[PDB]
Amino acid sequence: VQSRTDVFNEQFANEALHPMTKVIFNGLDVNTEVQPLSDDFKQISDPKG
Amino acid sequence: FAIDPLKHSKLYEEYGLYLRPHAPTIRSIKYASLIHSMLAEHAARHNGTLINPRMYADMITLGNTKVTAIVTYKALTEMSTLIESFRLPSGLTLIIFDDEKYQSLIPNYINQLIAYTQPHIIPTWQGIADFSDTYLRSYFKRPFELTASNLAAPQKHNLSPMTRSIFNNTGREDAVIRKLYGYGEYVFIKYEGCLITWTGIYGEVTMMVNLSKRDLGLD
Structure with a gap:
């Protein structure tokens, strides 16, 4: 059951007007990443005295 | 009109628009077709384009610019004795009605007046030419639909053969409806x-x- 916006000839004209950008995302939208402020400690596993 | 409906009557017959039989608008449609015999001659005289169409278009459309060396203003002088001849209180008006068959058949001398007129435009629904407008409704034959509901008499709906024509919408045969139902003398659009x-x-x-x-x- 479609009337009439599911046909691509009328859908393509109703997307030039108000172009959709935002989609439903039920998480956290990661857009950047952060480096640590100081690479200060080495992370060796079995220490040597 | 752009094309006169008494010398060129069959084109209006193709649209479902028959000419009313022969009064202030029966007299005016003869007055307008007299201008087309004057106008057509003038745009012979100098091929094709009648010369100064601005003072031309301010005479037919507007009751305006009476005019009386000369030969320049000769065709204006011959015409100001022609449109002040019949006494009108205002202009005649144009009537293109927006149809690629009708717009193609407009002669050259009428189209040069269209720039300087503000003509009256009659919007076609799909064609037929649809019958409002004191021009189109007082000049000729506001018709009568004849669908399956309005049966079967001309005395019943108070029609007259000099005012209303009949549009067959029965699905019956054409020849019987003006035989037994009394629609003789009532002309039918084709x-x-x-x-x-x-x-x-x-x-x-x-x-x-x-x-x-x-x-x-x-x-």
Whole structure:
């Protein structure tokens, strides 16, 4: 059951007007990443005295 | 009109628009066709283009610019004795009605007046030319639809052969409806295509074919 916006000839004209950008995302939208402020400690596993 | 309906009457007969038999508008439609014999001559005189169409268009459209060396202003002088001849209180007006058959058949000398007129435009629904407008309704033959509901007498709906023409929408034969129902002397418009109103997924869809109702089946 479609009337009439599911046909691509009328859908393509109703997307030039108000172009959709935002989609439903039920998480956290990661857009950047952060480096640590100081690479200060080495992370060796079995220490040597 | 752009094309006069007494020297060129069959084109209006093709649209379903028959000329009313022969009064202040019966007299005016003869006055307008007299201008076209004057106008056409003038745009012979100098091929094609009648010269100074601005003072031309301010005479037919507007009761305006009476004029009386000369030969320049000769065709204006011959015309100001022609339109002040018949006493009008205002202009005559144009009437292109927006049809690629009708707009193509406009002669050259009428189209040069269209720039300087503000003409009256009659909007075609799909064609037929649809019958409002004191021009189109007092000049000739506001018609009468004859669908399956309005049967079967001319005395019943108070029609007259000098004012209303009849549009066959029965599905019956053409020859019987002006035989036994009393529609003799009532002239009938001739349409040779048909319009189909289909059902649709989305709604009512009106398409047309240029075949008559007999030439294809489907009813």
